[PDB]
Paper text:
The rice NLR receptor Pik-1 binds the Magnaporthe oryzae effector AVR-Pik through an integrated heavy metal-associated (HMA) domain. However, the stealthy alleles AVR-PikC and AVR-PikF avoid interaction with Pik-HMA and evade host defenses.
The Asp67 and Lys78 polymorphisms that distinguish AVR-PikC and AVR-PikF from AVR-PikE and AVR-PikA, respectively, are located at interface 2. The crystal structure of the OsHIPP19-HMA/AVR-PikF complex revealed additional hydrogen bond interactions at interface 3 relative to integrated HMAs in the complex with AVR-Pik variants. Interface analysis performed with qtPISA identified 15 hydrogen bonds and nine salt bridges between Pikp-HMASNK-EKE and AVR-PikC, and 16 hydrogen bonds and 11 salt bridges between Pikp-HMASNK-EKE and AVR-PikF, compared to the 12 hydrogen bonds and eight salt bridges mediating the interaction between Pikp-HMANK- KE and AVR-PikC. This single mutation also supports additional hydrogen bonds at the interface between AVR-PikC (or AVR-PikF) and residues comprising β4 of the HMA domain.
Residue numbers in the entry:
A (entry chain C): 33 to 113
B (entry chain B): 187 to 197, 201 to 262
C (entry chain A): 187 to 197, 199 to 259
Write the structure that this text describes.
């Protein structure tokens, strides 16, 4: 999986809250399932295959979570962030 | 205080789903996102995702919570 | 092709819910967002949105509605 080589997620930044710094990409067996945006140095709940997974972000948009077998969610900073 | 919710909805059902989510108390914004416009992203205050999912299934069709994230303000 | 439209509406309780539902369900609308400190302006983004009919509907159904911005 090369994130430098993935189409940008289609997104909408709500104008009332800060703009989230990261793109995220969810894969089952190296096949892209879903994508979107999330905050750096923050946390979110994501449905990853059958399970709710608590995902933590560092300032660099690296995502840690206990993903079920065959699944991963990977983050990177959006242009100019 | 604000939270972002992303919902996958089988979806004119898009117009129906958008109208239902946008009518919810405490909504700041609603957006069709994804290339197929098959996801609704909602931002606001005191939105119960469980209640919103129930309303979508009963009104529009299959719907699944994808992402819930507090606004980092 | 891609449009951003901002409408100030007079919004009195469940007026936001009613205006947001109407705009959200208008043909060509991708996104609706309340903006301004008083959340009394609606930012509408989409493709093929008819701003004249949107303003008619909002005036008939919700209250006074002024076109502040149309951008393409």
């Amino acid at each position: 999986i090369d994130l430098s080589r993935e189409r940008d997620p289609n997104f909408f930044d709500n104008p009332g809250i800060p703009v989230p710094e990261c793109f995220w990409f969810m894969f089952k067996n190296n096949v892209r399932q879903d994508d979107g945006t999330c905050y750096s140095s923050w946390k979110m709940d994501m449905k990853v295959g059958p399970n709710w997974v608590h995902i933590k972000s560092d300032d660099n948009c690296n995502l840690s979570g206990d993903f079920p077998p065959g699944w991963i969610v990977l983050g990177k900073k959006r242009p100019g962030f | 205080l604000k939270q972002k919710i992303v919902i996958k909805v089988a979806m004119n059902c898009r117009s129906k789903a958008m109208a239902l989510v946008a009518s919810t108390g405490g909504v700041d914004s609603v957006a069709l996102v994804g290339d197929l416009r098959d996801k609704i992203e909602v931002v606001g205050y005191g939105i119960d995702p469980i209640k919103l999912i129930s309303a979508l299934r009963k009104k529009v069709g299959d719907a699944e919570l994808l992402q819930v994230e507090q606004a980092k303000e």
